Symmetry: none
Subunit: 47 residues, 3 copies
């Protein structure tokens, strides 16, 4: 039963705002991955 | 103005998640922009 | 973009993502383009 739909650009804008604003599980997943990327990629030295 | 209904949101969620995840992992410029805008605009 | 030292908290990230999605016109184009790429598995 694996259905996909296509959002227009305006409907993508609305949907993403809903999800970031209201879906705390959606937002935790983004932030956990963001954290992972920053800690992994931090250069040992700067200039 | 009107909003998307729950059905569209529910069927879109995981592609939207993957889209942002793709950008966060693979586009250093995408995170630059978040950091700049937070510093420059939001604080 | 070489090195990222800033680390936003969850609600800093949320607030910034929403500001850009609301107000930044090319940022949205960029999301849309990658989304269509994700959707069409290409």
């Amino acid at each position: 039963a694996d259905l996909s739909i296509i959002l227009s650009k305006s409907q993508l804008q609305d949907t993403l705002i809903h999800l970031i604003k209201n879906d705390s599980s959606f937002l935790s997943t983004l932030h956990e991955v963001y954290l992972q990327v920053l800690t992994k990629n931090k250069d040992n030295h700067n200039l």
